[PDB]
Amino acid sequence: AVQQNKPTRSKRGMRRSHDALTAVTSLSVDKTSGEKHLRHHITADGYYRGRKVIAK
Amino acid sequence: MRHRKSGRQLNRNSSHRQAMFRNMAGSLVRHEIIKTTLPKAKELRRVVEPLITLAKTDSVANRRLAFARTRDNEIVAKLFNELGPRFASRAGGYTRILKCGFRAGDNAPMAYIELVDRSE
Amino acid sequence: MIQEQTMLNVADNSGARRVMCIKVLGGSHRRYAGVGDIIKITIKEAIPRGKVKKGDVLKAVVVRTKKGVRRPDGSVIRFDGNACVLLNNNSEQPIGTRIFGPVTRELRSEKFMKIISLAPEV
RNA sequence: GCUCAACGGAUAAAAGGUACUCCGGGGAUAACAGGCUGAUACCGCCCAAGAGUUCAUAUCGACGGCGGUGUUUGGCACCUCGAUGUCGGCUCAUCACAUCCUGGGGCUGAAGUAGGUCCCAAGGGUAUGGCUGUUCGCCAUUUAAAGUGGUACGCGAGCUGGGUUUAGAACGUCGUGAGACAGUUCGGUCCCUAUCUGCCGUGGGCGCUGGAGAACUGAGGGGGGCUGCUCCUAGUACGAGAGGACCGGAGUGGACGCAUCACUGGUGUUCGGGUUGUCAUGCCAAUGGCACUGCCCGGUAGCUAAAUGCGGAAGAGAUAAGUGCUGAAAGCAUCUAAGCACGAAACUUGCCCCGAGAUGAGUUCUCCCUGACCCUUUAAGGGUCCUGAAGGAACGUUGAAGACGACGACGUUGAUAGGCCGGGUGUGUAAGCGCAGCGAUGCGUUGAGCUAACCGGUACUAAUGAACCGUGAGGCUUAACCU
RNA sequence: AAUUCCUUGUCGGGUAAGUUCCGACCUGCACGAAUGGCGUAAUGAUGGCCAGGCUGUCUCCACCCGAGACUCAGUGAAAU
RNA sequence: ACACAGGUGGUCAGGUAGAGAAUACCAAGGCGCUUGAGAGAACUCGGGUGAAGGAACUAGGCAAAAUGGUGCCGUAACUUCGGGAGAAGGCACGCUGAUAUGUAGGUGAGGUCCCUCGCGGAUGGAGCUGAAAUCAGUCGAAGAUACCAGCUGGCUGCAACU
RNA sequence: GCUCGCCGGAAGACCAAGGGUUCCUGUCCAACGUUAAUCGGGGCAGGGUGAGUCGACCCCUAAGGCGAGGCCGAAAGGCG
RNA sequence: AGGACCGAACCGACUAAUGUCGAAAAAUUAGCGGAUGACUUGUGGCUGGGGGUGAAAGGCCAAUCAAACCGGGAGAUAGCU
């Protein structure tokens, strides 16, 4: 249930191919406050679609 | 394989699942807005909505029924007296879901669930 | 549904009380017996004067089934028990004459028409 | 001189047992499996007395010989003793044909029927139980048949541990005893998260050469291929009678496989009700929590079988055994050398699924793109700013889609999901109130109340624009068509 | 037979079928009288067999509820 | 070896039901076990339910399933006369009213009687201890309703038995 | 702080044993906790245990040990 | 009255699953046997390696038992690897 010969560092790297994270690239700037909030996510202060939504 | 199946387990047995919604609903009504995890928030939508629909009418039977579940005199008095008349006109949809951030410590997607009104 | 090692209540005056199936006939590795089939049985409980005796082999036709049958409209006829009618191992004719309880309509074969006439109901 | 007879004499004195075991080494040497061989066994061929009523060749076929296969019991000791780790069963198989069943034919001492024997033929199929640990085998009952073998006497990094080999114990027998066995009898630790190859599924990258969105072509590959019984023909052909077809048609089944919940049912800890114990709600009442959903009675949608439908095929092409035809060598004759026509579940298709990563990378339809420039080794080039389309991805509501990806619908010009409204279904007459009853309780209001995924509507709530990725006319050569 | 090789002895009961089981026979391969012999109520987490009851053990699995498995975030081994 | 599902002497130990220090739910008091969030595949582990058949599975009824309580009735072969035996196998169990100041049996005196002068003896036996059985009615499919709680019988080897 | 769940002849409250400041407060988060930590039995500093009646010690002996002389034994030493 | 029966505490460890680099260097869960006695248990003593103890297996003697552990002879010897 174990290895037979150790895998090469080359074969090690190929297994790490599909491990890079994906960047966001969807930072919608708010209409009024202009924060860098994600789409369909409220801002850091609680603004969404140009509205004090959180009341906080 | 849950074809056409509803509900969510939320990694809990039924009794605990049910009892935490009994607590979460009353926690909402007393505060009108709470922060919770997103999947929990979506499942709360199928619980409080029946109660506001239960408060759109009023009787003694409904008062006992909304006391049958939710088990609180304070909440049932918060219900049937203010939330009912406040939502007398709306045909369903008494909750809003706002996705806040990410709970650093378990990376959970948290969200804000509140009443539609919240007029101050 | 009748299969091997299935106890059957006797339904004629052949002289038995309890019989046990051993081998569903008609086809290799057939696993079930419906209302109009021949099965091979043994005798496990008999009256002292009957035509047969305890420990013989012969055939039967399972006339009543707790699973029942399905009529072409979808209706079912489920009895309370499992009943058989003994046969003659070569000529297939019933041994006893008087047959108790109801029988189904689907037993209506030329080779079971004798049984149809002797049954009281249905 | 006595003893070295194991006779170059371990000094002239020295018998056994062990699976509590241990250590050093060996595949230098055994047991399991492989390999080589093929005596023995298994199969086939040759000769043929003779039996067979006559008739050797219908069949055997003594006596003998010539080979084949590598499945029996053995021979050798080549691989392994710094481990190839187990007898059988179970689950799951694959291949061979020396074929058990089904199919196609030849001959008879085959009337028919039903069999006998031989040849061709591997596609599918090829029991359930009783005793034994068993393989095997005997028996019971079936079935169209319950084929012979190779695969480490297939399979134990897949399960089991009964057998068999551990330390306990007893019987009989042998031995003075320790213990032993052509012996049997109870009990007795079966470890491993998969790197690679392999296989079953599912995606990412780039390429397919201008890019993108779809519909197919089809190389090639895989699945599938079983059959019983009854009736019509007909009780006809045939027959001495008794019996009794072929061929062709149709219905109805067993096993198996694919597909689906309309019905029959299963489950349904998210739906309704009953009820025991107990705690809390200040008490009664009415509810709620816990005791495996506390214990249970029903039960929607899904999923599902025991349920309900469907399939095997026909036919076509070229063939095997075999049947021929017309026909020379060999005036004849001859199925054959020329040629020509039939002839199987076999073979290539037909039927269903996958399928252009089929780098030989296909085809058709459609949509989008027609910038100013510097630069250098004027290169299918890069760089600067300007434009960034068709479309795509991400994000979001999500799904009878799904492990994650992926895939399908929708994203407000919107019914995608929740909620809501009505209906349906399920559960069986809520709560409160009023009457009668000593009361438990019962009756009226009430086929009520409450209803999870289901069905039809409804924007009440949540799916915000836009951004990001993707470009700017598509190398060279030759040829044919037009200036 | 906890002992019997031959052997699944032979006969009878039980079973549709019984190498195990119970009774019997006697050729006791190789029983035998305190290395105790033959029976024996009760008792036994004892060996073997049969029957009723009861059931998913099985025909043949089907569905559902939880803990992992799978995905995301943090930490982070092992034999070889 | 660890912030380890293990082990560690003595005292205290309430309420309801219950025979009980069993068990179920709770009090006092103490805790939610020191990785979570979603998903709701195959397969594994801990469990719930099952149409029809019911040991046909298998080395073997292994495991599960089932039996399971109280009162009353009834109980074989065999036997060392103790047993076997709770053999086997049956019937009633909830709740509410009366029958009957809760009957039967029961301690026993203020009291009357009593002598050697007795937190006293005899008597009715009050007061009261007081089940259960029976009759009538009522509810549910099910009344020992949960947890808890024997599977039973027959033949035989061996050993007496704990 | 408000609800909810679990144990409850215990996962409760107290002593002996054995450990040895882990007890309380201020303060800090590198390392230790199987993750994060402004939290802690972790680092750092300060503080905390008061007895004629509790326990120990003390008086008395049990099993048993040691043992003036004594007896035995190469020595050591053994028995008493 | 009982080396009596049923059955918790306590003690023991028959069956099955899980585990097998485990939570654990023999445990957990579900059921089981004894449970007023040849019982069990706290504290403190006495018996020691070819000996102690043993309801007897050759079991246990500090996770070690055909003979403990520590140190020494000892760098034993090793026709074997």
Swiss-Prot record, chain B:
A Pfam family reported for this protein in Swiss-Prot or TrEMBL: Ribosomal_L17
Keyword Protein biosynthesis among UniProt keywords: no
GO CC aspect terms: cytosolic large ribosomal subunit
InterPro entries linked to this entry: Ribosomal_bL17, Ribosomal_bL17_CS, Ribosomal_bL17_sf
Keyword Membrane tagged: no
Record-level GO BP terms: translation
Organism domain of life: Bacteria
Alphabetized UniProt keyword annotations: Ribonucleoprotein, Ribosomal protein
GO molecular function: structural constituent of ribosome
Matching NCBIfam families: L17
Protein family membership: Belongs to the bacterial ribosomal protein bL17 family.
Complex formation: Part of the 50S ribosomal subunit. Contacts protein L32.
PANTHER family reported in the protein's UniProt record: LARGE RIBOSOMAL SUBUNIT PROTEIN BL17M (PTHR14413:SF16), RIBOSOMAL PROTEIN L17 (PTHR14413)
The protein's name: Large ribosomal subunit protein bL17
Organism: Escherichia coli O81 (strain ED1a)
Source lineage: Bacteria, Pseudomonadati, Pseudomonadota, Gammaproteobacteria, Enterobacterales
Gene name for this UniProt entry: rplQ
